[PDB]
Design a protein around this motif. Sequence first.
Motif, PDB file in Angstrom:
ATOM      1  N   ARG A   1     -13.993  13.617   2.548  1.00 24.97           N
ATOM      2  CA  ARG A   1     -15.199  14.439   2.556  1.00 24.97           C
ATOM      3  C   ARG A   1     -15.455  15.057   1.189  1.00 24.97           C
ATOM      4  NH1 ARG A   1     -14.019  16.601   7.826  1.00 24.97           N
ATOM      5  NH2 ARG A   1     -15.417  15.711   9.406  1.00 24.97           N
ATOM      6  N   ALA A   2     -14.392  15.415   0.475  1.00 26.34           N
ATOM      7  CA  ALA A   2     -14.507  15.987  -0.856  1.00 26.34           C
ATOM      8  C   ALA A   2     -14.613  14.938  -1.953  1.00 26.34           C
ATOM      9  CB  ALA A   2     -13.308  16.891  -1.142  1.00 26.34           C
ATOM     10  N   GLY A   3     -14.411  13.666  -1.630  1.00 28.14           N
ATOM     11  CA  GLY A   3     -14.451  12.631  -2.642  1.00 28.14           C
ATOM     12  C   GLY A   3     -13.231  12.611  -3.532  1.00 28.14           C
ATOM     13  N   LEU A   4     -12.081  13.015  -3.009  1.00 30.64           N
ATOM     14  CA  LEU A   4     -10.852  13.112  -3.774  1.00 30.64           C
ATOM     15  C   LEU A   4      -9.863  12.053  -3.312  1.00 30.64           C
ATOM     16  CD1 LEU A   4     -10.377  16.974  -3.579  1.00 30.64           C
ATOM     17  CD2 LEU A   4     -11.315  15.724  -5.510  1.00 30.64           C
ATOM     18  N   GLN A   5      -8.784  11.916  -4.079  1.00 30.53           N
ATOM     19  CA  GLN A   5      -7.643  11.115  -3.673  1.00 30.53           C
ATOM     20  C   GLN A   5      -6.429  11.956  -3.320  1.00 30.53           C
ATOM     21  OE1 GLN A   5      -8.114   7.478  -4.079  1.00 30.53           O
ATOM     22  NE2 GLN A   5     -10.230   8.075  -4.524  1.00 30.53           N
ATOM     23  N   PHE A   6      -6.369  13.202  -3.768  1.00 26.61           N
ATOM     24  CA  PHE A   6      -5.277  14.120  -3.496  1.00 26.61           C
ATOM     25  C   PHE A   6      -5.450  14.761  -2.121  1.00 26.61           C
ATOM     26  CE2 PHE A   6      -2.304  15.579  -6.952  1.00 26.61           C
ATOM     27  CZ  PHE A   6      -2.306  14.354  -7.588  1.00 26.61           C
TER      28      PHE A   6
ATOM     29  N   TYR B   1       4.287  13.264  -3.792  1.00 31.05           N
ATOM     30  CA  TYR B   1       2.889  13.032  -4.142  1.00 31.05           C
ATOM     31  C   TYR B   1       2.658  11.618  -4.662  1.00 31.05           C
ATOM     32  CZ  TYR B   1       1.568  17.974  -3.736  1.00 31.05           C
ATOM     33  OH  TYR B   1       1.291  19.237  -3.273  1.00 31.05           O
ATOM     34  N   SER B   2       3.558  10.692  -4.320  1.00 27.81           N
ATOM     35  CA  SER B   2       3.677   9.433  -5.048  1.00 27.81           C
ATOM     36  C   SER B   2       2.490   8.514  -4.799  1.00 27.81           C
ATOM     37  CB  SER B   2       4.982   8.741  -4.668  1.00 27.81           C
ATOM     38  OG  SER B   2       6.087   9.380  -5.280  1.00 27.81           O
ATOM     39  N   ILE B   3       2.045   8.416  -3.545  1.00 33.97           N
ATOM     40  CA  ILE B   3       0.944   7.517  -3.213  1.00 33.97           C
ATOM     41  C   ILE B   3      -0.367   8.024  -3.802  1.00 33.97           C
ATOM     42  CG2 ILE B   3       2.033   6.488  -1.200  1.00 33.97           C
ATOM     43  CD1 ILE B   3       0.004   8.618   0.314  1.00 33.97           C
ATOM     44  N   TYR B   4      -0.532   9.346  -3.880  1.00 34.52           N
ATOM     45  CA  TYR B   4      -1.755   9.912  -4.439  1.00 34.52           C
ATOM     46  C   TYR B   4      -1.803   9.726  -5.947  1.00 34.52           C
ATOM     47  CZ  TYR B   4      -1.152  12.079   0.075  1.00 34.52           C
ATOM     48  OH  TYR B   4      -0.936  12.303   1.408  1.00 34.52           O
ATOM     49  N   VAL B   5      -0.674   9.956  -6.621  1.00 31.52           N
ATOM     50  CA  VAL B   5      -0.621   9.763  -8.068  1.00 31.52           C
ATOM     51  C   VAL B   5      -0.761   8.281  -8.414  1.00 31.52           C
ATOM     52  CG1 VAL B   5       0.843  10.109 -10.108  1.00 31.52           C
ATOM     53  CG2 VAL B   5       0.644  11.894  -8.425  1.00 31.52           C
ATOM     54  N   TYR B   6      -0.233   7.397  -7.562  1.00 26.81           N
ATOM     55  CA  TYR B   6      -0.441   5.965  -7.759  1.00 26.81           C
ATOM     56  C   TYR B   6      -1.899   5.566  -7.546  1.00 26.81           C
ATOM     57  CZ  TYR B   6       1.355   1.253  -8.343  1.00 26.81           C
ATOM     58  OH  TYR B   6       1.616  -0.005  -8.820  1.00 26.81           O
ATOM     59  N   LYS B   7      -2.588   6.197  -6.589  1.00 24.65           N
ATOM     60  CA  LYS B   7      -4.015   5.939  -6.402  1.00 24.65           C
ATOM     61  C   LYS B   7      -4.816   6.361  -7.625  1.00 24.65           C
ATOM     62  CE  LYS B   7      -4.091   6.201  -1.437  1.00 24.65           C
ATOM     63  NZ  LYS B   7      -3.760   7.283  -0.471  1.00 24.65           N
ATOM     64  N   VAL B   8      -4.471   7.517  -8.197  1.00 28.65           N
ATOM     65  CA  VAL B   8      -5.152   7.998  -9.399  1.00 28.65           C
ATOM     66  C   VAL B   8      -4.855   7.089 -10.592  1.00 28.65           C
ATOM     67  CG1 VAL B   8      -5.320   9.954 -10.963  1.00 28.65           C
ATOM     68  CG2 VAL B   8      -5.254  10.344  -8.540  1.00 28.65           C
ATOM     69  N   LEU B   9      -3.611   6.610 -10.695  1.00 33.24           N
ATOM     70  CA  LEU B   9      -3.239   5.696 -11.772  1.00 33.24           C
ATOM     71  C   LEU B   9      -3.972   4.367 -11.659  1.00 33.24           C
ATOM     72  CD1 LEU B   9      -1.469   4.735 -14.150  1.00 33.24           C
ATOM     73  CD2 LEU B   9       0.227   4.090 -12.450  1.00 33.24           C
TER      74      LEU B   9
ATOM     75  N   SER C   1       6.925   3.633 -13.700  1.00 36.81           N
ATOM     76  CA  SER C   1       8.327   3.582 -13.324  1.00 36.81           C
ATOM     77  C   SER C   1       8.656   4.726 -12.371  1.00 36.81           C
ATOM     78  CB  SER C   1       9.220   3.642 -14.564  1.00 36.81           C
ATOM     79  OG  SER C   1       9.116   4.901 -15.199  1.00 36.81           O
ATOM     80  N   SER C   2       9.847   4.650 -11.774  1.00 37.73           N
ATOM     81  CA  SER C   2      10.249   5.651 -10.792  1.00 37.73           C
ATOM     82  C   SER C   2      10.581   6.984 -11.452  1.00 37.73           C
ATOM     83  CB  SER C   2      11.438   5.142  -9.982  1.00 37.73           C
ATOM     84  OG  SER C   2      12.518   4.803 -10.831  1.00 37.73           O
ATOM     85  N   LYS C   3      11.108   6.952 -12.677  1.00 36.01           N
ATOM     86  CA  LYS C   3      11.422   8.195 -13.374  1.00 36.01           C
ATOM     87  C   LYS C   3      10.154   8.922 -13.806  1.00 36.01           C
ATOM     88  CE  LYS C   3      14.897   7.442 -16.215  1.00 36.01           C
ATOM     89  NZ  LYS C   3      16.293   7.175 -16.657  1.00 36.01           N
ATOM     90  N   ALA C   4       9.171   8.180 -14.323  1.00 33.36           N
ATOM     91  CA  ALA C   4       7.873   8.767 -14.639  1.00 33.36           C
ATOM     92  C   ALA C   4       7.154   9.217 -13.375  1.00 33.36           C
ATOM     93  CB  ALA C   4       7.025   7.761 -15.414  1.00 33.36           C
ATOM     94  N   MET C   5       7.390   8.512 -12.266  1.00 33.48           N
ATOM     95  CA  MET C   5       6.876   8.922 -10.965  1.00 33.48           C
ATOM     96  C   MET C   5       7.433  10.275 -10.536  1.00 33.48           C
ATOM     97  SD  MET C   5       4.609   7.644  -8.629  1.00 33.48           S
ATOM     98  CE  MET C   5       4.163   9.369  -8.697  1.00 33.48           C
ATOM     99  N   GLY C   6       8.745  10.461 -10.683  1.00 35.08           N
ATOM    100  CA  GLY C   6       9.352  11.743 -10.355  1.00 35.08           C
ATOM    101  C   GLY C   6       8.914  12.857 -11.286  1.00 35.08           C
ATOM    102  N   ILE C   7       8.673  12.523 -12.555  1.00 35.21           N
ATOM    103  CA  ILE C   7       8.199  13.519 -13.514  1.00 35.21           C
ATOM    104  C   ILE C   7       6.781  13.965 -13.172  1.00 35.21           C
ATOM    105  CG2 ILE C   7       7.498  13.766 -15.938  1.00 35.21           C
ATOM    106  CD1 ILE C   7      10.048  12.425 -16.689  1.00 35.21           C
ATOM    107  N   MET C   8       5.926  13.026 -12.759  1.00 39.30           N
ATOM    108  CA  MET C   8       4.581  13.402 -12.329  1.00 39.30           C
ATOM    109  C   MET C   8       4.612  14.209 -11.035  1.00 39.30           C
ATOM    110  SD  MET C   8       2.220  12.337 -14.560  1.00 39.30           S
ATOM    111  CE  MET C   8       1.058  13.040 -13.396  1.00 39.30           C
ATOM    112  N   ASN C   9       5.559  13.906 -10.141  1.00 36.93           N
ATOM    113  CA  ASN C   9       5.743  14.710  -8.931  1.00 36.93           C
ATOM    114  C   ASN C   9       6.119  16.150  -9.266  1.00 36.93           C
ATOM    115  OD1 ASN C   9       5.791  13.970  -5.912  1.00 36.93           O
ATOM    116  ND2 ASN C   9       6.277  12.026  -6.918  1.00 36.93           N
TER     117      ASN C   9
END
Lengths: 94, 94, 81, 82, 226, 226, 96, 98, 101, 101
Positions: J9-14, B7-15, B25-33
């Motif tokens: 479409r949902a306005g999300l990033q996930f 889920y790394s690219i999506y969590v990075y987009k949210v960040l 970091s990569s460890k915090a990345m894996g923890i968020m995954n």
Amino acid sequence: RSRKESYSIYVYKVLKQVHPDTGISSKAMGIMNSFVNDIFERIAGEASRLAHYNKRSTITSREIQTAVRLLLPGELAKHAVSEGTKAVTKYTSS
Amino acid sequence: RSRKESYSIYVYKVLKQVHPDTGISSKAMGIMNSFVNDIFERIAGEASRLAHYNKRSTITSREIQTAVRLLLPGELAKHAVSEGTKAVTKYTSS
Amino acid sequence: VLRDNIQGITKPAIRRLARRGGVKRISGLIYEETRGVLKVFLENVIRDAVTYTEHAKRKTVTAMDVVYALKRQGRTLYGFG
Amino acid sequence: KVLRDNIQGITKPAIRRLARRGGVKRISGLIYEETRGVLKVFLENVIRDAVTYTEHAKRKTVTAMDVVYALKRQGRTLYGFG
Amino acid sequence: EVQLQQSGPELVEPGTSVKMPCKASGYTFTSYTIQWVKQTPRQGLEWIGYIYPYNAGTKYNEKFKGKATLTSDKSSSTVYMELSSLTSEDSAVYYCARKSSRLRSTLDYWGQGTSVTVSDIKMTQSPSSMHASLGERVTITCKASQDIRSYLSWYQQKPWKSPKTLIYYATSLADGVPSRFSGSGSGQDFSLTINNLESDDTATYYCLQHGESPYTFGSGTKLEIK
Amino acid sequence: EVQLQQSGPELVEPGTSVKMPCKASGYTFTSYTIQWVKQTPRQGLEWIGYIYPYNAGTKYNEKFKGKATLTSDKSSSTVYMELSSLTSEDSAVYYCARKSSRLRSTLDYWGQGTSVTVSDIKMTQSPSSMHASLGERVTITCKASQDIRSYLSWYQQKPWKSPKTLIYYATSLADGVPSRFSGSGSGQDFSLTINNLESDDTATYYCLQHGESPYTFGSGTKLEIK
Amino acid sequence: PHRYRPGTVALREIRRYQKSTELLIRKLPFQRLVREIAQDFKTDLRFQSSAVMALQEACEAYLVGLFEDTNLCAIHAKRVTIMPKDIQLARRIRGE
Amino acid sequence: KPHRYRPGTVALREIRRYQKSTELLIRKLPFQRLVREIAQDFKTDLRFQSSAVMALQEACEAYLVGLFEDTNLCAIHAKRVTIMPKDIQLARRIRGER
Amino acid sequence: AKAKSRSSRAGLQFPVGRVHRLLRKGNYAERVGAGAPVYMAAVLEYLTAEILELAGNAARDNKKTRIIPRHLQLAIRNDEELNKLLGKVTIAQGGVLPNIQ
Amino acid sequence: AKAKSRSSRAGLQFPVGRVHRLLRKGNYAERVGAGAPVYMAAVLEYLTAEILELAGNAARDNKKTRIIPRHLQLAIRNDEELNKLLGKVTIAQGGVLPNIQ
DNA sequence: GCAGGGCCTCTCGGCTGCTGATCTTCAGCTGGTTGCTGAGAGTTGCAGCATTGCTGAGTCTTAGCAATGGATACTTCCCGATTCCCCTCACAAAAATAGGTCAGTCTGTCTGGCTAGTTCTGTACTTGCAGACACAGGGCATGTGGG
DNA sequence: CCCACATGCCCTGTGTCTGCAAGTACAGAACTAGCCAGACAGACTGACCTATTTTTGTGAGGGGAATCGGGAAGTATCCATTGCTAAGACTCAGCAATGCTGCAACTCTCAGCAACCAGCTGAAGATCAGCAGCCGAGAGGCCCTGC
């Protein structure tokens, strides 16, 4: 009045084969039905998780045996593994 | 290489959305995954259990909303219900 | 509308609960604490039960819904289905 | 090779450091053997389930994902290893 | 891995009291009952009682109440047994054995035996003593008195050694026992069969029931090879 | 259900200290922070600080360290506030307001206010005061100085009364607020729109940001109806 | 007149109430408390008779299991009287 | 005279120091040898990933630190500051492990 | 041909066919093997036989011919492995142990 | 027509499509509704947004511009609802909460 | 330590209601049989990874010692919890009632699976580069022995 | 209560280095578009069951006084821990070779699914003696008081 479908008659045959003279109350039958259902969901959930972990699509007796070994403590697991292996061996020979 | 699919690219987009100058970091990345996978498994299991209890064969946004109400505590459930309702309404409006 | 029924859990009832729990001597401040703990536990179970009945589009809380609400907190109950 | 008596490798200052992380000011002298027994019991409980997962996968190498599953089915979910 | 250490021989004058340990190792101590078995040359193996260290629960034989007293010490994983007012007919070797709380399980691991010397269902074994060469088939019958629901075990005892479990639940092989040994029968009729003999098989074979509350052994069957 | 009780007015001489409680009930007391807001006619509403009763976590305004001191008591569900070295310009009405620890959530429930008398983002509200008749469309603007990611709330305050939340997260309706009120905007530009008016919308309307650490209110907008 | 010293009536009560299986909280006060608590979650709710029954067995089992740990904390503090600090410590170690 | 700290000052210093860091406090090679010896009794000739041994280590440190927190709570409840095996036993019994 | 139950084929009393149907309808896997319901029915039958025999022994020692939830509670809580299996389980009308020392 | 993502479409990033595929392949129900992956991805996005923003705030107060497991653990353990959600969860290299006194 | 007077569970009888074991009927769900297909087992090969060994610097542990302060035992005493009695007040049971909710049947319809094609986006791989780790030097709050 | 010297820790400064962020092929998965069928929603309708009233003859709860006994506080002892130091020893980092195990790919065959039908198993409804509950009387262990 829509076919409640309990385990009560099977628990009765097991009870009459391990204790031919003792009976059981309806409350204790409800307890033991809940017990059989709870152990069913535990073993089936562990086997489903094992099959998902190993990227399989079928639940087999190997998955059931590993779920039994994971969930039952001590000699309960050994005797249940023996019972399951004996029943599968008897069923395969028909 | 077998396309491990995190889920790394999506969590990075949210960040980068909530903190435009802050990295991870990569460890915090894996923890968020692991966090995303665990919460997905919890809410999906509760929704499947709800659909099994009510003798339904489908999982819908009502089951997801009830599972969110059961698992998230306090105001977390209220804000998550608000986000889920807003996203479902926006998707329905296309 | 019901108001202040936590005192319906009387002092001899809490003493009987402690006697079943193995307690020989009970302080006088135990009872209000026990009422608070029982109220918190009852709210936690009843909220999940009401959530189950509201998802089922029902208005009567059933024993099976209470059993599900207890099971999702790791307090599995036998004897009600 | 067969290893023997490695529970004494968990030294007295290591248990002291874990207690100081736990917030403990004073430590009795009999704490360390009891802590070694408790840590040993926890380790067999996790490792038996991890080895069960490894044997069901028909492997000889215990993986981190197996350790994560063995921890998760004992209610000790671990984030950071998959 | 599983060991049940005991004490040495006690030379003890009559009228006193004796206590012997059954320190156990290699397993979770509270999950298994420790059962005590006495052995005399005159009437063979006899079951005395057991202690369950999970709840300090006891059950004794009818003829050993007062003569025996069982205690557990959870800290050192040790089981002690008290024999009081030692009569001249108490000169025997006392075995302590491990048995799980499951009804199917039996005495799988035994102690080496403590020789103390002082200064219902009856199980009948049809052969008393048999002789065989190195290659035939030999059977041993354990005709029972009442109905037992396959709760029968088979043991092999070398001279001056602890008994070794062969068959439990009247058909199931014990741990480490080869497929050469085979047990059969249920209800009241039971049988132990040895496929081919070796020089190791020269021993005395007992059958033990644990269906009802006082556990009773068999008379014994001596097997002689060539 | 959720209420935040407080004390009466305090006529206090200069130079001493005063303690006012914020005894709260109707919710899980540790899960929600208790923010404190002073209100003078000269400077409007001003955010002082908050306590978190779960971990005694505290954060104050930059201009309020030393002047203010926040303590929590978990047994009686009470939050206290001390003002030390009371200057003449401390005569105000001090409100305590509940707020969840979620960043989206706002000061939703307020106390009645204790009148104590002594004997950085700037947020601009473009209409200082407006007049409107019974059925018109009105709009209040709350242009900001820095960027806040939709962390804006709107409040309605009757004269001699506690403020009431209408909008949180710059668009979402609060609890029990009718759908006539509608908030909009993100970033730096925000708007509050009231659809059709009644006689009970005659109040002063404030906007609060909580995007950065010192929370700052708006100047206020007095809305007069016919 | 016959009087017992303080405590022997208490151990007789332990022996009496550890042998019975009956519920020790009165059913109508427990039902009233259950309906008052459920009233705060949904207006004009309804209950099966077995739902309140299941709630009562769950609550009494929870309170008995709490009082066992409370008694353990009381003996650990070298006392025989259980206290709200023992209730608090037992709940804190249990994680509630 | 050489400098000597009173008992407790250094202990509070290590509490403050080790409650701030995130490092592993048990040495890696003794923990790995302990893990291999324990797993020897379940399956002979086993192999271990380094991440697997590390995950076991993080789990063991977290479990022991939480148990020592509960043990310190028991010690404070018994009006002591010295933790005891009875305190560890009481915490593990209330937690449901004994 | 004459129909034969899979329970009779496996020598069980528990329903192999019903366990198969609950495994298929229970949303556990896409497919279910043939020996898995046999194994599950055998394990469930062993567990109900063990608990029923211990409860019957407790009822015999209590001089009763009927098993009640008190007898079930005594049978489960007097056993280490059964108490480890059912530690987080409340048995209604079960009571507690008499704590005799 | 030009393809549009369901997340867009949902306005999300996930990923709504990936969440839908994981719901379909994860053996949860026989069928999955259209709005269920949208609601799932929205709830997951909100939860990671809250945790990441609190951890970034902790990193900023530690005068660091990179989130580490210590920052994640501090942000989770300093919050009621995050602590109740992740009570039985160990965060690797997270440490513990420092004491006050 | 030994003896006599209440009294509180065990033991036994025996009668009594109630409920659990057994019989009957119907419906629905399991088994038999055939055909179809895709999931997993088996073989070969490949890369990657965990095991083992060797070396060297260097941080951590260990044993002994002194001295301090904290746990423990003992006593007093006084707070408070137990026990008993009375009197009183709600709990429980049981019958009736209305109405309100829940479950069942039928019907239609909308929505989710299925399939084939397409493209696009998420993943592995490979760069550079700057946040953070490293040592090192002032500076500050306080730790602890005198006065 | 103030001072001293001394020590541990935060902060500042700079080289550096490794891990993080950004840019490229590419292939696997998500999107699009019809299509089909079945799961679920909508509306009647019976009927069970839950809430509400009323009586009542009790069983449990509440209040107050006497008293015993347990908890709290203070004192002294002594022992068990903490802090410190020098010597060893064992962890750690790095590098290299190995063989061993975990993936990956292709084949195929066998096991599991789909479907239809008949019939046998199991759930619902009545019925009834036997097991357990209830009430009453006798015996034995036990508690309280006294010597």
